[PDB]
Design a protein around this motif. Structure first.
Motif, mmCIF file in Angstrom:
data_model
loop_
_atom_site.group_PDB
_atom_site.id
_atom_site.type_symbol
_atom_site.label_atom_id
_atom_site.label_comp_id
_atom_site.label_asym_id
_atom_site.label_seq_id
_atom_site.Cartn_x
_atom_site.Cartn_y
_atom_site.Cartn_z
ATOM 1 N N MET A 187 -15.977 15.279 25.357
ATOM 2 C CA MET A 187 -15.583 16.434 26.146
ATOM 3 C C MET A 187 -15.502 16.148 27.635
ATOM 4 S SD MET A 187 -16.614 20.307 24.347
ATOM 5 C CE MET A 187 -17.872 19.914 23.103
ATOM 6 N N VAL A 208 -11.698 28.974 23.054
ATOM 7 C CA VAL A 208 -10.244 28.849 23.018
ATOM 8 C C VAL A 208 -9.414 30.023 22.521
ATOM 9 C CG1 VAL A 208 -9.054 26.771 23.197
ATOM 10 C CG2 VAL A 208 -10.848 26.904 21.707
ATOM 11 N N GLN A 210 -16.787 25.725 26.624
ATOM 12 C CA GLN A 210 -16.593 24.367 26.206
ATOM 13 C C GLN A 210 -15.186 24.330 25.644
ATOM 14 O OE1 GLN A 210 -20.347 22.132 24.718
ATOM 15 N NE2 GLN A 210 -19.807 23.707 23.304
ATOM 16 N N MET A 211 -14.501 23.232 25.850
ATOM 17 C CA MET A 211 -13.123 23.108 25.441
ATOM 18 C C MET A 211 -12.916 23.104 23.944
ATOM 19 S SD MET A 211 -12.184 19.180 26.764
ATOM 20 C CE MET A 211 -11.053 18.609 25.360
ATOM 21 N N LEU A 212 -13.925 22.694 23.214
ATOM 22 C CA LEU A 212 -13.857 22.556 21.794
ATOM 23 C C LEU A 212 -14.543 23.702 21.055
ATOM 24 C CD1 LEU A 212 -14.134 18.776 20.915
ATOM 25 C CD2 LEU A 212 -12.171 20.023 21.367
ATOM 26 N N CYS A 213 -14.640 24.852 21.657
ATOM 27 C CA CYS A 213 -15.310 25.961 21.030
ATOM 28 C C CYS A 213 -14.284 27.000 20.656
ATOM 29 C CB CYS A 213 -16.337 26.530 21.993
ATOM 30 S SG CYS A 213 -17.101 27.992 21.551
ATOM 31 N N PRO A 214 -14.254 27.360 19.401
ATOM 32 C CA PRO A 214 -13.240 28.286 18.930
ATOM 33 C C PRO A 214 -13.319 29.623 19.618
ATOM 34 C CG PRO A 214 -14.853 27.930 17.292
ATOM 35 C CD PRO A 214 -15.095 26.912 18.301
#
Ligand SMILES: [Ca+2]
Ligand SMILES: [Cl-]
Ligand SMILES: [Cl-]
Ligand SMILES: [Cl-]
Ligand SMILES: [Cl-]
Ligand SMILES: [Cl-]
Lengths: 152, 154, 154, 150
Positions: free
Chosen positions: A75, A41, A34-38
């Protein structure tokens, strides 16, 4: 025993789509994020980039699979496309097929992933050999890929 | 691969271990870590990487060997100093001292395999054939790919 | 602070530099890195942290000093061996050798301040008085906070 | 320059008055949610300060300053990002300027871009502005100096 790798993809966002027959005869790394997962990323994506850059598509193909299972309205695939350029991802990225009335998209459901990041490793015969959740050590990942590459 | 040389190390003494033999090695992938005790790249990077391998992969599959090849400051990097280095750094894998050659700064194994320097890595397969030699910092990912590859070869 | 002792190194010799007095140091924050050349904590973390300070902060503000306090394996960690360590690792700050005490393994400065071992840091203020003594790994951010704080005190 | 921020809204915390600010060193972490440098390095570093140093001494402030890709980077998205990355320091949304790409606080302080850090002293006066990646040690020295100053 082991199942074949069959991605259910709503769209391929930066590349021509890939069939299974395309990927047969190559080791496949699917990085599920997921793009918003630390964790994705900071670690998983950069690890995938590294792979893509180091090894050629003759041997290994890196596929990004964006499987959004929470916060869907923020997202979006539009968001993803920006994220991709902004982060400089050059490997093929697919959006997991969403399911009607469902938070979990289809590939993620089918293979029962615990979450993101996850990686899926498939052999040259198209069949799934590893599924790992969480941060994977660069060393451990190299051994796993290498093992797949050289076995007969 | 018909001409890949077989790994043979020329060694003065085994410092912290009974010596291995070549027979002991066969059927195992071999990692030889070539270092000097006072070389920053070895101490910071190469030795800790070898230690990590030794911890992670069982000796039934991979054998890690240290090779101390002193090519400079010989009087300082003695076998006694090395024993202390090994204790201080907690090195558990077997360590050998490269056989010194009279009148020459470069030791025997380093000479034989033409090493640029330290750190270097030598990887050999289960048959003992040297398959890779590398000088300098090696990425953990690259190292794993190489070993995994060697481990699964028929 | 009235109670704080002044920094007084007891030094056998200065290995790579002309010696420094407390007077030379006065008006500067002093960082003393207490190390052994063969200690992992030192080689991996403390010494490189000291080099970073030295490269980053001007000597008009902060002075870094290396103190080699050898308390074990003395025959191996001589001043000659230290000179080699310094060259190999590129240490450019002044390094002193802690004065040995006859008959005893623990050297003088180390005894005097009752250091737990190596690595250790001693920080002194602009008037030369010891303000912190810390054993072990110190995080870079925390060290910045500590130095930054001494630097701006009245 | 006394630090003053132009805030449309505080996403995860009640608002900060000067009364809350006074007597404290302030760290303003000026970021975009999709900017790698912010995400990789700058935000985590800010989180570290917040975790490390008590709020009674240092107040960490996140300021979301969207100058591009705006519809993506909404206050709805930011709340999600904060939640995902587990940010617990107060974060404020830049006030926008109507018909303008860059927002009000970013504008007035002539910031180069994201990430940026703004340091202010105990009396609220702005003491440093820095763009790009900053070393942990350097940031320590700067904060440490501000904290101890008289
Ligand atoms: Ca031999
Ligand atoms: Cl890439
Ligand atoms: Cl070990
Ligand atoms: Cl230096
Ligand atoms: Cl936080
Ligand atoms: Cl605006």
């Amino acid at each position: 025993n082991a199942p074949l790798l069959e991605l259910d993809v709503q769209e391929w966002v930066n590349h021509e789509g890939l069939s299974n027959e395309d990927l047969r005869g190559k080791v496949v790394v699917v990085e599920v994020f997921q793009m918003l997962c630390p964790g994705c990323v900071n670690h998983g994506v950069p690890q995938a980039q590294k792979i893509h850059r180091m090894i050629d598509e003759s041997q290994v193909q890196v596929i990004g699979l964006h499987s959004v299972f929470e916060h869907h309205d923020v997202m979006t695939p539009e968001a993803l496309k920006v994220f991709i350029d902004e982060f400089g991802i050059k490997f093929p990225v697919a959006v997991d097929m969403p399911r009607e009335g469902q938070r979990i998209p289809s590939t993620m459901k089918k293979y029962r992933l615990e979450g993101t990041p996850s990686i899926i490793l498939a052999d040259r015969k198209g069949r799934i050999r590893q599924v790992q959740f969480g941060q994977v050590d660069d060393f451990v990942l190299g051994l796993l890929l290498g093992s797949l590459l050289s076995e007969t």
